[PDB]
Amino acid sequence: MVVFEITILGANGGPTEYGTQCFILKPARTEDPELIAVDGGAGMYQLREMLVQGDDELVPSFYEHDREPIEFFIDSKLNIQKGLSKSLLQSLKRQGEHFESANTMKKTYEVFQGITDYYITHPHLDHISGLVVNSPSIYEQENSKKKTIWGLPHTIDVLQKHVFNDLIWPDLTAERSRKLKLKCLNPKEVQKCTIFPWDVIPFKVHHGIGVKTGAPVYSTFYIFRDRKSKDCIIVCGDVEQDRRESEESLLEEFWSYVAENIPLVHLKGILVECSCPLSSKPEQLYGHLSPIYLINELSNLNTLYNSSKGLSGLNVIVTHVKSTPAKRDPRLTILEELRFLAEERNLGDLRISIALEGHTLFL
Amino acid sequence: MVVFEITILGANGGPTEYGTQCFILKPARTEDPELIAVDGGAGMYQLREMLVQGDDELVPSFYEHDREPIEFFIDSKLNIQKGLSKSLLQSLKRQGEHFESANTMKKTYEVFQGITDYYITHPHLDHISGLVVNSPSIYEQENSKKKTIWGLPHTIDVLQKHVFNDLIWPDLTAERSRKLKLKCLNPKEVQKCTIFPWDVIPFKVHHGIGVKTGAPVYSTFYIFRDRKSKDCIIVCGDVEQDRRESEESLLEEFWSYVAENIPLVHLKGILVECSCPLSSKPEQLYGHLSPIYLINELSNLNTLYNSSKGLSGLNVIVTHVKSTPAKRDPRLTILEELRFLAEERNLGDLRISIALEGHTLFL
Ligand SMILES: [Zn+2]
Ligand SMILES: [Zn+2]
Ligand SMILES: [Zn+2]
Ligand SMILES: [Zn+2]
């Protein structure tokens, strides 16, 4: 039944600077070296950690305890494992002697060369820092695996002008070998992934406004659909609720598309933020979701599917939780708040988990 | 004799994305909460690690071994300790009960609020990623400690246009409370630090050329001078040797200034890159130093000081070493190559160490 393997490289919303948003995707079970990244925060560094670290598992927290039981953060039915998947690792183990002789750094370069394509949601630095700093790895060899960075224009235009511009970073897109490329996607259009037999469908969403400019700051939701099984996952960039009159109902458009085109049984997971707990703090919430806003969005999706079973069976994987100087880990607070609000709103057998770095989900 | 405490938050040259360049400075022994940062790669995340991790000490490597003895990377006379200094930690311990009640995350916010001023060498993303992602922490409170980002114009203009621009990052400099400010420094001019009784003297250096534009890419060397003791440290941005005819001898200007104005006995350390080992690889070396180029620069400084004792007693702390898919840790290769070349060039009792994240130097 499992179609997707999702490696959580980074699920941190800030303001600490490591492990920011990046998810690796591949088909379940298969052993090709090729990998897709959604966003570009945590990258090589995190792959290396997972190659070393790989039960009463404890995960980092730094609140009530420095480490906490893994099960506290996840739905009890979630198919999750620590480390990289057996099949991802098998692409290194295709050569017996070579795998054993290769040190951790070498293994990291090898796995990382397989990242063919990034789908970037928006160009905020926390979503691109690993993509950028890791990028010179592409020049380690003559016979070279090339990388492509995909996005809607609001992302690609910014990367071209403000990142790969010989000021913030050497303009690797200008190098004649074209080992790093920027490519635009059209919104709402079914586009094809390059290696996997998957469709990718990007949708624009709102993510606040400029501090100086007041201009809308856009983000992206990506649908990945396995063509054979028709199973899908939704992987989201940072997002806030739409404003009734002053703007386009981008989220309504998105949920309507999902309900029309993807039966709930085929929706294997949504990776979506809840940056903040219910406790106000407007400065930290701008451009983001809190549990009431996320539950309101899921309630809208529920209304569109229009089943008496609610969202029963749906896996919601909560990403981009921010640190806060609070007594309790906000991931735990948010998880409890979301579960409470889902129960209050009668959303059915909805399965809510927090995304945990250094783990793979099987959906 | 020790005047400076230098906390190494990040000394990684890339392409792995965590622990990139950032050094914290404070006067030795004193317990004020205020701190200076040079560069802005590793930040809050690394402070938090150091608050938790704090003998046969092993440090991360990931080559021949995943962890290696600390002493392999340093000169035997180097005054170094793991973790934050006792006096830095004392600023938290001024309140007994409060310190004990505060969790690791809270302690991290508290220490980090003390970073008053950043001195940025150049705006490449690896030198600013932590500064940027950490910056919203400034809005955690009403009665707020404010931060200032200092640099030469080649840095500040780029940060204004390409980073704090509501596209790559919210433009926090436009927020009316002015809790984050960008300020320019004049090159070669003795300027004053805001809290510590220190002079700061910035010098422009070369750091390669644009891939697309061919334009010179500049960097900065910072001299910090304690006015009472007259002791100085030099903390460097990324740099390459000058080209004889085609450009200004920026490095010659710098070493000449040092030899004229700072007696060797007062020069307590230089933190300077050696990104690459002697083994060629032009693509990785562009804009950077290898051991022959670094030793040539130190030889030039030696000639200017003009002593038969060479650079005896000088601490050279090597930063920004890049990963490479090699059998041996390049920090070890580089250390051996530098020591060999220094001996061959008769530079005297020069003390060479690699900068190690998660440690404090006392110079
Ligand atoms: Zn974000
Ligand atoms: Zn964002
Ligand atoms: Zn650098
Ligand atoms: Zn640089």
XYZ file of C-alpha atoms and ligand atoms in Angstrom:
730
model
C 0.000 0.000 0.000
C 2.941 2.343 0.696
C 3.908 4.332 -2.395
C 6.150 7.137 -1.056
C 9.244 7.366 1.112
C 9.735 10.817 2.643
C 13.032 11.594 4.371
C 12.668 14.525 6.770
C 15.971 16.398 6.526
C 14.661 19.538 8.174
C 11.386 20.551 9.776
C 12.560 23.511 11.891
C 10.670 26.806 11.399
C 13.407 28.929 13.013
C 14.811 30.978 14.522
C 17.593 28.449 15.153
C 19.344 28.067 11.838
C 20.028 24.332 11.281
C 17.565 21.705 10.117
C 15.302 24.151 8.278
C 12.758 22.947 5.764
C 13.736 20.161 3.357
C 12.061 16.834 2.516
C 13.508 14.123 0.254
C 11.087 12.015 -1.811
C 11.460 8.727 -3.649
C 9.221 5.811 -4.622
C 8.888 3.165 -1.926
C 11.145 0.078 -2.043
C 13.081 0.832 -5.252
C 16.857 1.341 -5.171
C 17.657 3.991 -7.765
C 20.076 6.686 -6.564
C 17.811 9.476 -7.839
C 16.027 11.643 -5.287
C 13.704 14.669 -5.318
C 13.994 17.453 -2.726
C 11.099 19.662 -1.671
C 12.669 22.856 -0.435
C 16.328 23.322 0.306
C 17.007 24.071 3.961
C 18.700 21.013 5.584
C 20.795 19.049 3.001
C 24.241 17.333 2.868
C 24.965 17.959 6.533
C 21.801 16.174 7.562
C 22.294 13.284 5.132
C 25.711 12.783 6.717
C 24.199 12.714 10.230
C 21.680 10.107 9.154
C 24.480 7.996 7.636
C 26.272 8.014 11.049
C 23.323 7.697 13.473
C 22.027 4.649 11.569
C 14.107 0.660 20.539
C 13.504 3.380 23.141
C 14.323 6.157 20.692
C 14.818 9.713 22.016
C 14.793 12.794 19.799
C 16.206 16.288 20.430
C 13.870 18.735 22.199
C 15.676 21.200 24.550
C 12.640 22.164 26.632
C 11.432 20.119 29.638
C 14.134 17.633 28.558
C 16.996 17.880 26.129
C 15.753 14.622 24.560
C 12.205 13.216 24.422
C 10.608 9.878 23.509
C 9.861 9.751 19.779
C 6.345 8.398 20.297
C 5.258 11.604 22.058
C 5.467 13.480 18.725
C 3.647 11.084 16.403
C 0.368 9.290 15.778
C 0.648 5.677 16.976
C -0.161 4.312 13.493
C 2.493 6.308 11.628
C 4.860 4.213 9.550
C 8.180 5.834 10.484
C 11.774 4.717 10.836
C 14.937 6.367 12.097
C 17.545 7.025 9.430
C 17.586 6.527 5.686
C 15.475 3.736 4.229
C 16.941 0.360 3.392
C 16.243 0.926 -0.300
C 17.858 4.409 -0.353
C 20.926 2.875 1.342
C 20.962 -0.029 -1.155
C 21.978 2.389 -3.951
C 25.310 2.702 -2.099
C 25.491 -1.048 -1.378
C 25.347 -1.970 -5.093
C 29.136 -2.184 -4.788
C 30.044 -4.309 -1.751
C 33.740 -3.473 -1.333
C 33.269 0.166 -2.374
C 30.557 0.819 0.215
C 32.752 -0.558 3.007
C 35.837 1.351 1.887
C 33.941 4.655 1.527
C 34.125 6.914 4.564
C 31.113 8.834 5.880
C 32.041 11.983 3.949
C 32.362 10.046 0.683
C 29.017 8.298 1.250
C 27.473 11.740 1.817
C 28.777 13.054 -1.514
C 27.523 9.891 -3.258
C 23.985 10.007 -1.814
C 23.810 13.729 -2.421
C 24.758 13.454 -6.102
C 21.437 11.618 -6.527
C 19.384 14.690 -5.647
C 18.344 15.520 -9.272
C 15.609 18.071 -8.734
C 14.517 20.559 -6.077
C 10.958 21.890 -5.892
C 11.232 25.150 -3.977
C 8.149 26.635 -2.328
C 9.459 30.162 -1.749
C 12.866 31.829 -1.646
C 13.066 32.746 2.059
C 16.565 31.911 3.171
C 15.504 29.048 5.522
C 14.105 27.198 2.473
C 17.211 27.547 0.319
C 20.301 27.734 2.564
C 21.324 24.075 2.114
C 20.567 24.086 -1.598
C 22.870 27.079 -1.947
C 25.770 26.121 0.306
C 25.715 22.491 -0.946
C 25.673 23.516 -4.630
C 29.453 23.580 -5.317
C 29.435 19.790 -4.745
C 28.087 19.565 -8.308
C 31.635 20.387 -9.571
C 33.428 17.511 -7.852
C 33.608 15.498 -11.114
C 33.759 15.775 -14.922
C 31.132 13.115 -15.701
C 28.563 14.984 -13.663
C 25.023 14.474 -12.415
C 23.239 17.805 -13.010
C 20.739 19.534 -10.707
C 17.592 21.480 -11.544
C 15.813 23.929 -9.234
C 12.087 24.192 -10.028
C 9.588 26.734 -8.796
C 6.834 29.142 -9.664
C 8.054 32.517 -11.020
C 7.827 34.249 -7.593
C 10.545 31.845 -6.483
C 12.679 31.438 -9.602
C 12.914 35.151 -10.421
C 14.093 35.868 -6.875
C 16.710 33.095 -6.941
C 18.086 34.452 -10.222
C 18.207 38.094 -9.112
C 19.024 37.826 -5.407
C 20.893 34.558 -4.836
C 22.794 33.261 -7.864
C 24.069 36.735 -8.634
C 27.820 36.731 -7.841
C 27.133 38.686 -4.634
C 25.120 36.393 -2.321
C 26.496 33.336 -4.149
C 28.585 32.659 -7.235
C 26.237 32.536 -10.210
C 26.529 28.808 -10.874
C 23.650 29.035 -13.356
C 25.949 31.082 -15.658
C 28.652 28.378 -15.771
C 28.687 26.919 -19.294
C 28.297 23.253 -18.285
C 24.784 24.074 -16.985
C 25.240 21.665 -14.070
C 22.853 23.866 -12.052
C 19.687 25.086 -13.781
C 16.690 27.205 -12.744
C 13.367 26.245 -14.343
C 9.883 27.692 -13.960
C 6.651 25.787 -13.484
C 3.172 26.938 -14.468
C 0.661 27.146 -11.616
C -2.206 24.597 -11.493
C -0.690 22.620 -14.398
C 0.068 18.906 -14.273
C 3.763 18.689 -14.998
C 6.014 15.615 -15.111
C 8.809 14.616 -12.770
C 12.069 13.858 -14.593
C 12.892 10.351 -13.322
C 10.029 9.047 -11.204
C 6.727 8.168 -12.938
C 5.033 10.993 -11.032
C 3.060 14.105 -11.772
C 3.901 17.352 -9.981
C 1.179 19.995 -9.645
C 2.114 23.356 -8.056
C -0.334 25.862 -6.536
C 0.365 29.369 -5.319
C -0.621 30.315 -1.744
C -0.251 33.366 0.542
C 2.602 33.768 3.034
C 2.221 37.266 4.445
C 3.344 40.647 3.161
C 6.553 42.640 2.837
C 7.619 44.580 5.938
C 8.804 47.535 3.830
C 6.957 46.950 0.578
C 3.603 45.665 1.817
C 3.661 43.406 -1.265
C 2.063 39.934 -1.101
C 4.672 37.273 -0.242
C 3.764 34.075 -2.069
C 4.465 30.444 -1.380
C 3.653 27.110 -3.054
C 1.896 23.837 -2.327
C 3.091 20.840 -4.350
C 1.013 17.786 -5.182
C 3.035 14.704 -6.136
C 0.987 11.963 -7.784
C 2.212 8.460 -8.527
C 0.648 7.745 -11.918
C 0.329 3.973 -11.486
C -1.299 3.840 -8.043
C -2.933 7.293 -8.275
C -1.687 7.852 -4.711
C -0.684 11.414 -3.847
C 1.125 13.410 -1.219
C 0.863 17.162 -0.653
C 4.037 18.941 0.460
C 3.538 22.559 1.507
C 5.501 25.758 1.750
C 4.898 28.296 4.540
C 1.327 29.604 4.415
C -1.310 31.747 6.114
C -5.104 31.832 5.782
C -6.507 33.928 2.914
C -8.188 37.275 3.636
C -11.881 37.173 2.587
C -12.160 40.293 0.404
C -8.681 41.785 -0.035
C -7.265 38.777 -1.930
C -7.780 35.636 -4.029
C -9.035 32.545 -2.169
C -5.919 30.569 -3.103
C -6.464 27.974 -0.368
C -10.106 27.427 -1.370
C -8.902 26.885 -4.959
C -6.358 24.378 -3.674
C -8.688 22.344 -1.441
C -11.338 22.357 -4.149
C -8.820 20.934 -6.626
C -7.761 18.239 -4.143
C -11.346 17.203 -3.316
C -12.316 17.148 -7.018
C -9.291 15.259 -8.299
C -7.840 13.135 -5.502
C -10.115 10.739 -3.615
C -9.313 10.796 0.114
C -8.188 7.150 0.032
C -5.479 8.218 -2.475
C -4.312 11.150 -0.348
C -1.523 9.489 1.622
C -0.290 12.521 3.529
C -0.148 16.272 3.786
C 3.045 17.922 5.050
C 1.891 21.326 6.226
C 3.110 23.894 8.714
C 1.880 24.866 12.094
C 4.582 27.333 13.044
C 3.017 28.572 16.268
C 0.840 27.333 19.149
C -2.473 28.989 20.033
C -0.742 31.381 22.475
C -0.918 34.687 20.559
C 2.459 36.385 19.832
C 1.471 38.205 16.570
C 5.100 38.923 15.552
C 5.893 35.201 15.290
C 2.587 34.238 13.637
C 2.602 36.695 10.684
C 2.564 34.727 7.411
C 2.015 31.403 9.216
C -0.516 29.061 10.770
C -1.520 28.346 14.345
C -3.655 25.347 15.329
C -7.001 27.121 14.879
C -6.063 28.303 11.382
C -4.700 24.916 10.318
C -7.793 23.125 11.673
C -9.995 25.664 9.838
C -8.228 24.794 6.577
C -8.618 21.056 7.191
C -12.289 21.682 8.056
C -12.680 23.365 4.641
C -11.137 20.333 2.925
C -13.467 18.123 4.980
C -16.533 20.090 3.841
C -15.442 19.692 0.207
C -14.921 15.923 0.443
C -18.373 15.913 2.078
C -18.207 12.541 3.852
C -19.841 11.563 7.140
C -16.498 9.812 7.866
C -14.753 13.225 7.936
C -11.038 13.014 7.170
C -10.757 9.491 8.587
C -7.439 7.892 7.648
C -5.730 11.127 6.565
C -2.148 11.620 7.759
C -1.331 15.228 8.588
C 2.396 15.719 9.124
C 3.033 19.058 10.846
C 6.159 20.908 9.745
C 8.021 24.167 10.347
C 7.358 24.471 14.058
C 9.258 27.452 15.452
C 11.300 27.557 18.641
C 9.926 29.746 21.388
C 11.305 30.576 24.847
C 8.537 28.505 26.480
C 8.591 25.893 29.230
C 7.226 23.128 26.975
C 8.302 21.979 23.519
C 5.925 23.795 21.149
C 5.720 20.712 18.930
C 4.026 18.909 21.836
C 1.772 21.889 22.606
C 0.770 22.190 18.940
C 0.153 18.452 18.578
C -2.176 18.475 21.604
C -3.966 21.611 20.421
C -4.463 20.235 16.914
C -5.791 16.899 18.201
C -8.152 18.681 20.603
C -9.479 21.023 17.906
C -9.865 18.177 15.402
C -11.949 16.231 17.964
C -14.023 19.350 18.758
C -14.634 19.891 15.016
C -15.487 16.182 14.493
C -12.957 15.610 11.683
C -13.021 11.835 12.207
C -10.041 9.492 12.385
C -7.518 12.176 11.426
C -3.936 11.126 12.223
C -1.689 14.019 13.240
C 2.070 13.723 13.690
C 4.927 16.210 13.956
C 7.639 15.884 11.279
C 10.889 14.716 12.888
C 14.271 15.308 11.312
C 16.430 12.258 10.724
C 13.449 9.978 10.024
C 11.757 8.460 7.007
C 7.978 8.230 6.579
C 6.388 5.479 4.493
C 3.048 6.623 3.087
C 48.367 37.661 29.552
C 45.162 36.435 27.863
C 43.043 39.333 26.614
C 40.523 37.706 24.229
C 38.050 34.846 24.397
C 37.053 33.537 20.965
C 34.149 31.094 20.716
C 34.287 29.123 17.463
C 30.648 28.671 16.445
C 31.450 27.684 12.885
C 34.633 27.064 10.934
C 33.253 24.976 8.045
C 34.075 26.211 4.513
C 31.327 24.135 2.857
C 29.826 22.495 0.984
C 28.002 20.963 3.961
C 25.701 23.676 5.206
C 25.887 23.722 9.039
C 28.610 25.252 11.177
C 29.692 27.808 8.573
C 31.819 30.778 9.519
C 31.066 32.612 12.771
C 33.300 33.571 15.717
C 32.120 35.150 18.983
C 34.465 37.581 20.762
C 34.538 38.979 24.278
C 37.166 40.243 26.719
C 38.769 37.509 28.802
C 37.410 36.784 32.304
C 34.670 39.443 32.482
C 31.010 38.442 32.839
C 28.991 40.959 30.842
C 26.301 39.410 28.624
C 27.427 41.452 25.606
C 29.128 39.633 22.745
C 30.530 40.512 19.308
C 30.135 38.176 16.318
C 32.530 38.087 13.379
C 30.518 36.764 10.482
C 27.129 35.154 10.757
C 27.129 31.523 9.662
C 26.690 29.269 12.757
C 24.637 31.056 15.497
C 21.807 30.158 17.953
C 21.799 26.496 16.984
C 25.463 26.164 17.836
C 25.187 28.135 21.082
C 22.464 25.692 22.112
C 24.700 22.690 21.327
C 27.491 24.151 23.421
C 25.054 24.719 26.310
C 24.141 20.975 26.207
C 27.544 19.368 25.491
C 29.109 21.276 28.408
C 39.609 14.328 29.153
C 40.071 12.205 26.021
C 38.035 14.588 23.885
C 36.962 13.486 20.382
C 35.693 15.887 17.730
C 33.615 15.212 14.595
C 35.586 14.312 11.451
C 33.793 11.793 9.148
C 36.872 10.646 7.229
C 39.213 7.888 8.490
C 37.065 8.028 11.654
C 33.761 9.656 12.417
C 35.405 11.210 15.500
C 39.067 12.132 16.068
C 41.214 13.139 19.051
C 41.102 16.912 19.543
C 44.868 17.198 19.972
C 45.470 16.050 16.384
C 44.037 19.364 15.106
C 45.832 21.865 17.335
C 49.230 23.154 18.408
C 50.164 21.624 21.778
C 50.482 25.070 23.413
C 47.053 26.356 22.363
C 44.893 27.576 25.219
C 41.571 25.963 24.277
C 38.559 24.611 26.119
C 35.451 22.727 25.066
C 32.227 24.683 25.410
C 31.465 28.236 26.440
C 33.832 29.944 28.858
C 33.127 30.091 32.564
C 32.800 33.873 32.394
C 30.379 33.804 29.415
C 28.274 31.258 31.344
C 28.415 33.409 34.509
C 26.208 36.045 32.816
C 23.417 33.436 33.004
C 24.369 32.380 36.553
C 23.896 35.916 37.945
C 20.460 34.635 38.968
C 20.840 31.300 40.782
C 17.249 30.022 40.755
C 16.524 31.451 37.294
C 19.493 29.707 35.675
C 18.418 26.341 37.096
C 14.776 26.791 36.120
C 15.631 27.901 32.560
C 15.570 25.119 29.987
C 18.209 24.784 27.264
C 16.092 26.672 24.721
C 15.543 29.572 27.131
C 19.263 29.734 27.973
C 19.962 29.873 24.225
C 17.644 32.857 23.737
C 19.236 34.591 26.751
C 22.858 34.115 25.626
C 21.933 35.059 22.090
C 20.276 38.338 23.102
C 23.769 39.442 24.177
C 25.113 39.378 20.625
C 25.054 43.205 20.114
C 27.094 43.601 16.958
C 28.087 41.532 13.929
C 31.133 42.375 11.812
C 30.477 40.736 8.458
C 33.368 40.062 6.089
C 31.367 39.465 2.907
C 27.763 38.636 2.060
C 28.182 35.094 0.687
C 25.360 33.057 2.125
C 27.624 30.823 4.302
C 28.719 33.962 6.206
C 25.221 35.271 6.888
C 22.780 32.334 7.084
C 22.653 32.198 10.906
C 22.518 35.967 11.260
C 19.508 35.966 8.952
C 17.541 32.974 10.206
C 18.236 33.889 13.871
C 17.177 37.533 13.407
C 13.452 37.234 14.303
C 14.568 36.368 17.867
C 15.084 40.126 18.293
C 11.252 40.503 18.489
C 10.693 38.147 21.418
C 10.298 41.073 23.869
C 9.220 44.725 24.187
C 12.192 45.923 26.265
C 14.591 44.775 23.586
C 18.331 44.436 23.092
C 19.020 45.746 19.565
C 21.451 44.312 17.000
C 23.720 46.087 14.532
C 25.290 44.524 11.434
C 28.544 46.264 10.449
C 30.521 45.931 7.256
C 32.296 47.674 4.436
C 29.979 48.952 1.659
C 30.527 45.855 -0.556
C 28.840 43.889 2.216
C 26.231 46.313 3.544
C 24.874 47.353 0.140
C 24.388 43.697 -0.795
C 22.624 42.858 2.479
C 20.238 45.780 1.960
C 19.445 44.987 -1.681
C 19.588 41.187 -1.772
C 18.797 39.884 1.717
C 16.655 42.205 3.836
C 14.393 42.912 0.891
C 11.050 41.189 1.632
C 11.924 38.441 -0.870
C 14.927 36.536 0.546
C 14.001 37.687 4.067
C 11.510 40.068 5.640
C 13.071 43.523 5.655
C 13.600 43.773 9.408
C 15.684 46.920 8.894
C 12.477 48.720 7.777
C 10.602 47.910 11.012
C 10.143 51.171 12.934
C 11.675 49.991 16.231
C 15.063 49.706 14.454
C 15.912 46.580 16.456
C 18.051 45.432 13.502
C 20.320 48.009 11.858
C 22.830 47.956 8.986
C 25.835 50.265 9.387
C 28.826 50.909 7.146
C 32.458 51.117 8.178
C 35.210 53.052 6.421
C 38.164 50.964 5.238
C 41.538 51.365 7.024
C 39.959 53.608 9.692
C 40.225 52.982 13.423
C 36.643 52.717 14.576
C 35.289 51.991 18.065
C 33.450 48.937 19.323
C 30.167 49.795 21.058
C 30.579 48.064 24.439
C 34.084 46.648 24.737
C 37.018 49.088 25.084
C 38.319 47.924 21.703
C 39.210 49.404 18.365
C 37.996 47.736 15.170
C 39.954 48.332 11.958
C 38.576 46.845 8.703
C 40.581 46.219 5.515
C 39.304 45.163 2.119
C 40.800 42.052 0.468
C 40.192 40.013 -2.717
C 37.975 36.917 -2.815
C 37.758 35.950 -6.475
C 35.547 37.184 -9.290
C 31.948 36.843 -10.434
C 31.155 33.747 -12.508
C 28.806 35.723 -14.781
C 29.952 39.278 -14.166
C 33.715 38.835 -13.870
C 33.538 41.598 -11.236
C 35.964 41.556 -8.279
C 34.389 39.837 -5.248
C 35.645 41.560 -2.110
C 36.071 40.411 1.447
C 37.306 41.951 4.716
C 39.960 41.424 7.363
C 39.144 42.814 10.813
C 41.689 43.890 13.402
C 40.360 44.032 16.968
C 42.612 45.912 19.381
C 42.188 46.019 23.140
C 43.070 49.625 23.963
C 44.433 48.973 27.461
C 46.779 46.063 26.722
C 47.378 46.995 23.059
C 46.874 43.290 22.288
C 45.217 42.502 18.960
C 43.603 39.676 17.070
C 43.018 39.514 13.315
C 39.834 37.780 12.162
C 39.615 37.204 8.413
C 37.007 36.738 5.743
C 37.558 34.418 2.758
C 40.551 35.563 0.705
C 42.867 34.781 -2.204
C 46.335 36.079 -3.099
C 46.466 39.376 -5.022
C 47.353 39.392 -8.732
C 50.611 41.338 -9.321
C 49.579 43.775 -12.074
C 45.829 43.433 -12.657
C 44.837 44.643 -9.164
C 45.647 46.532 -5.952
C 48.040 44.801 -3.530
C 45.405 44.738 -0.784
C 47.202 42.025 1.197
C 50.537 43.875 1.041
C 48.729 46.977 2.355
C 47.272 44.878 5.162
C 50.488 43.153 6.268
C 52.360 46.439 6.045
C 49.795 48.061 8.345
C 50.053 45.172 10.822
C 53.875 45.205 10.886
C 53.959 49.014 11.254
C 51.310 49.315 13.946
C 51.125 46.071 15.916
C 54.304 44.634 17.434
C 54.383 40.842 17.023
C 54.240 40.326 20.802
C 50.851 42.138 20.751
C 49.488 40.038 17.885
C 47.740 37.287 19.833
C 46.239 35.391 16.918
C 45.205 35.423 13.301
C 42.069 33.528 12.254
C 42.551 32.977 8.544
C 41.313 30.486 5.987
C 42.989 27.627 4.284
C 40.035 26.229 2.385
C 41.920 23.628 0.370
C 44.937 21.306 0.652
C 47.828 21.442 -1.824
C 46.144 18.848 -4.087
C 45.029 21.017 -7.034
C 41.256 20.996 -7.797
C 40.978 24.544 -9.302
C 37.153 24.656 -9.022
C 37.300 24.392 -5.219
C 40.277 26.749 -4.805
C 38.965 29.796 -6.740
C 38.760 32.792 -4.380
C 40.536 30.914 -1.565
C 43.866 29.868 -0.110
C 45.804 26.621 -0.166
C 48.801 25.967 2.095
C 51.390 27.405 -0.308
C 49.412 30.634 -0.728
C 48.755 31.025 2.997
C 52.427 30.360 3.824
C 53.430 32.904 1.143
C 51.252 35.519 2.854
C 52.713 34.713 6.277
C 56.199 34.872 4.715
C 55.360 38.402 3.499
C 54.297 39.405 7.017
C 57.518 37.836 8.319
C 59.637 39.882 5.893
C 57.888 43.070 7.049
C 58.415 42.392 10.763
C 62.034 41.700 9.752
C 63.143 39.664 12.781
C 65.675 36.833 12.876
C 63.147 35.132 15.217
C 60.651 34.905 12.317
C 57.040 34.675 13.474
C 57.999 32.941 16.727
C 55.077 32.863 19.156
C 52.397 33.741 16.586
C 49.176 31.717 16.752
C 47.674 31.013 13.343
C 44.169 29.584 13.639
C 43.107 28.045 10.320
C 39.446 28.461 9.407
C 37.000 27.679 6.605
C 38.389 24.301 5.625
C 36.157 22.723 2.984
C 34.936 19.138 2.886
C 36.291 17.028 0.069
C 35.569 13.415 -0.918
C 39.071 12.376 0.212
C 40.314 9.493 2.343
C 41.790 11.781 5.022
C 40.288 14.738 6.872
C 41.519 17.782 4.925
C 41.995 19.711 8.169
C 44.709 17.194 9.100
C 46.239 17.280 5.607
C 46.271 21.092 5.619
C 47.725 21.284 9.132
C 50.595 18.967 8.143
C 51.206 20.828 4.887
C 51.228 24.218 6.606
C 53.622 23.037 9.331
C 55.930 21.477 6.731
C 55.965 24.611 4.564
C 56.487 26.882 7.579
C 59.526 24.783 8.609
C 60.857 24.812 5.019
C 60.442 28.618 4.900
C 62.074 29.028 8.355
C 59.204 31.038 9.886
C 60.350 30.232 13.431
C 58.188 29.101 16.340
C 54.914 29.605 14.466
C 51.997 27.833 16.176
C 49.377 26.522 13.753
C 46.022 25.103 14.828
C 42.763 24.326 13.043
C 39.690 26.182 14.360
C 37.299 23.703 15.991
C 33.612 24.406 16.417
C 32.230 24.163 19.930
C 35.455 25.408 21.549
C 36.748 28.618 23.063
C 40.261 29.978 22.488
C 41.984 32.161 25.077
C 44.511 34.466 23.420
Zn 10.022 29.169 6.515
Zn 8.898 31.795 4.803
Zn 32.969 31.280 2.796
Zn 32.966 33.437 0.259
